[PDB]
């Protein structure tokens, strides 16, 4: 269960070094 | 992603998607 | 950049309270 | 985003460039 | 919805170049 | 402030206003 | 000082679990 | 090193997410 | 309430000079 | 750690335990 | 406390003197 | 961990190699 900023926090594991798009609507 | 990985449950490999 | 990777990682802590329903976009 | 915010202290303006 | 230490960060966001209080009582 | 900001929903400029 | 701006977040997420309802004072 | 010691808070963030219900060890 | 990666938070302010163990199961 | 510390509430003093 | 805790590792009575 | 993780950018191969 992934929400708020500790989705964004995952969201940064994974991507923080490509780069991301974060959209929640 | 709201959806995916807070609604319903999420990989790590699975939010590779989102990397730009 | 290490410490800039760190720094990163506050950076779109930052950014997600700082623009709401909008999201924000995160690129290096 | 880093350049600008990871090199001095940025501020809220600095950041609400990186909104969508 | 800031609650928790999350209610915190976004205190420190906003004033940590200035300071501030946390009195949650 | 945890009724301003938890209980009720906030805002960043609304907050400006605990800083010291 | 960035790293000590950095740093600050780090203290204030301590402080909060440190201190308890009593709550804290964070000064630069 | 204090640097060191928050890039020891990230990593342990990261080995939560990373490990699942495995958990992780964290060692200096 | 500490749960998720706030218990880990929390392990980490006090243990985190010594090392710790984190085994959820 | 768990039960203790998510379902049953906590301490920092507590948690020294787990320290390795 | 930026003085004292950013400089060297604080410990936890370090940080107690800034709880209220 | 801090020595391999700390001094360059880890990857989430360094980093699986903490699991238990
Ligand atoms: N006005 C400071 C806002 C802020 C919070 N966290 C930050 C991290 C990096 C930065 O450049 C700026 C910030
Ligand atoms: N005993 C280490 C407690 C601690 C946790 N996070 C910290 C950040 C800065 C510092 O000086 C100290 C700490
Ligand atoms: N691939 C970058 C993963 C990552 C996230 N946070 C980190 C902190 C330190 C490090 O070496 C690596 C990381
Ligand atoms: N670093 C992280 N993303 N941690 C995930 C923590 C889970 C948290 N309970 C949530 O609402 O999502
Ligand atoms: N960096 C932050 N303050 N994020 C806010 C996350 C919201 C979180 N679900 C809460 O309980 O408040
Ligand atoms: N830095 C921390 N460990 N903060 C604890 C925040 C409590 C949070 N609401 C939880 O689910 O546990
Ligand atoms: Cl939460
Ligand atoms: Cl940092
Ligand atoms: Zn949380
Ligand atoms: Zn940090």
Not at chain 1, 5 to 19: F, I, K, P, T
Not at chain 2, 11 to 18: A, D, I, R, T
Request: with cysteine; proline share 2%; charged share 15%.
């Amino acid at each position: 269960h992934l929400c708020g900023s500790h989705l964004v926090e995952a969201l940064y594991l994974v991507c923080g070094e490509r780069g991301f798009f974060y959209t929640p609507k | 992603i709201v959806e995916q990985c807070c609604t319903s449950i999420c990989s790590l490999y699975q939010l590779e998607n989102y990397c730009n």
